[PDB]
Amino acid sequence: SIDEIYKYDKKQQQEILAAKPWTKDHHYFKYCKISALALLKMVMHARSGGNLEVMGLMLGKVDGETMIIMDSFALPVEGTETRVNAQAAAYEYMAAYIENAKQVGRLENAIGWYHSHPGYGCWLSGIDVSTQMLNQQFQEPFVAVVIDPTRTISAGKVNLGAFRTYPKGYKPPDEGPSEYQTIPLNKIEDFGVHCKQYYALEVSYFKSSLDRKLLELLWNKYWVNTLSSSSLLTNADYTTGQVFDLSEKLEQSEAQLGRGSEDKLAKATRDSCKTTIEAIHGLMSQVIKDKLFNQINI
């Protein structure tokens, strides 16, 4: 049953919240299921922030070792990424929004917070770790979602991560696959300092039976939008920002060869490769459009 996940069982949630199985294991929560609606809303909000970090709250529930995100909403806050617990400034707003949401049938409560990292990957900074540690101390169960709208667009693939912090003093296990991401130099130090203070959940997505039907029928007209993308100029500032960072990365890799870490040039080469590959893909779509609509004549 595709729509089974949409059923809200209040008593079952109260039973789980009274049981608190997460207190028995700091790696209790392993999976993160996100609704197509919440993904779209978070990506739409993240993109709307442009090159500035934005944040919001996520509404959902828990099911065994799985955290479920059903919906999300933007918070009118300043200082995302600079202020510890910046979300706190929207407390009043959050209380009213949720109250009003309950009036229209949004039964799911706060399950987490999402914020954007425009052009610098999905991970938790020092400020993010302090914020998530506060949330896990006072608002458990809670999860932190990070989205890179810029990389989503440039790669043509959703760039999202779901994370949970470890309590102060607690040491992680051997596990930590760590899927490689290019981290800019102005962020890499902070990344390295706090990278072992949290873990990444396994993310998956879902949609309803009606969403499935509607998206096939949407495609019957949405195909036009795939042949009129214009991705090269939409987020042009990202590639320029990455190149600006790449140049300083190459300056450091040159300094490594100068006199005397573990091969910075290869990392910088993989970064320049990724950025260029994305640019060429943009040109591929542009040339495809030129071949289809311009090279026809009378």
């Binding site: 036009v224 939008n225 009129s228 993308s229 214009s230 100029l233």
Partner: protein, 273 residues
């Protein structure tokens, strides 16, 4: 303030009478103050006729106060009341239309122009031509404005600074914005000629609208040309591709609607390949 507790309708009738009297005295500010007291009672009343009387008076106050969009909305709502005689529902619609044309440019005015344009009854009004042309962002001729100005009440012909009326200026600004949708760029001599105004006035008003942020563009004073928000280059190419493919979808839908037999017969050939 008294010991007597007067009924809602007595208070409403008295406030309406006061408001009506202040309007007769050409004191719309005082009329509005008392019509505002009446507004707090009108919903508690069960006297339909009295509620219609305040609504008419309320709209008239707003009209005389130059709160044209608000007046237009109230007059328009009156035009839908089935208990009001058809002739009066039209007088109300005519008042709504005139107020909407005279209203300050913006989304509320444009939404009201849309509401009125969708109303078939507006075709019985002499100003329909103007409505249609305003709604459709068309250039309005001097002659058409002359006839419309003749359709107005004296208070509605208010004049700013140089003896020029709000309407005269609103029509020029509407025409400039409408011309901005036809051209990428135009000379002041030509723009003046198309708008039936001197070239210096076309430049001055265009310059004002650009500075005020009501029109996007830039002026070249040496070449004597105004350049309108082009939005050209590659995004235009993408939008033209969209128009072409949307034309494709509309054509397929029309083929399937008019002749579904051949649509299915040729549809099976796609699966056969």
């Amino acid at each position: 303030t008294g010991q007597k507790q007067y009924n809602v309708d007595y208070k409403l009738e008295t406030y309406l009478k006061i408001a009506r009297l202040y309007l007769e005295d050409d004191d719309p500010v005082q009329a509005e103050a008392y019509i505002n007291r009446a507004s707090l009672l009108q919903n508690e009343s069960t006297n339909e006729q009295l509620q219609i009387h305040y609504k008419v008076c309320y709209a008239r106050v707003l009209d005389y106060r130059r709160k044209f969009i608000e007046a237009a909305q109230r007059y328009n709502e009156l035009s839908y009341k089935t208990i009001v005689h058809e002739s009066e529902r039209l007088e109300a619609l005519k008042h709504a239309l005139h107020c909407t044309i005279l209203a300050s440019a913006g989304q509320q005015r444009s939404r009201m122009l849309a509401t009125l344009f969708k109303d078939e009854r507006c075709q019985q009004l002499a100003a329909y031509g103007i409505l249609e042309k305003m709604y459709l962002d068309r250039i309005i001729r001097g002659n058409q404005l002359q006839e419309f100005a003749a359709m107005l009440m004296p208070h509605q012909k208010a004049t700013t600074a140089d003896g020029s009326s709000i309407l005269d200026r609103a029509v020029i600004e509407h025409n400039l914005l409408s011309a901005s949708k036809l051209y990428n760029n135009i000379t002041f001599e030509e723009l003046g000629a198309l708008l039936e105004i001197p070239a210096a006035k076309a430049e001055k008003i265009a310059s004002q609208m650009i500075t005020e942020g009501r029109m996007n563009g830039f002026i070249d004073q040496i070449d004597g040309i105004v350049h309108f928000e082009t939005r050209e280059a590659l995004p235009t190419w993408d939008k033209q591709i969209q128009s072409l493919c949307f034309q494709v979808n509309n054509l397929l839908e029309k083929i399937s609607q008019t002749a579904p037999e051949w649509t299915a017969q040729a549809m099976e050939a796609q699966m056969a390949q």
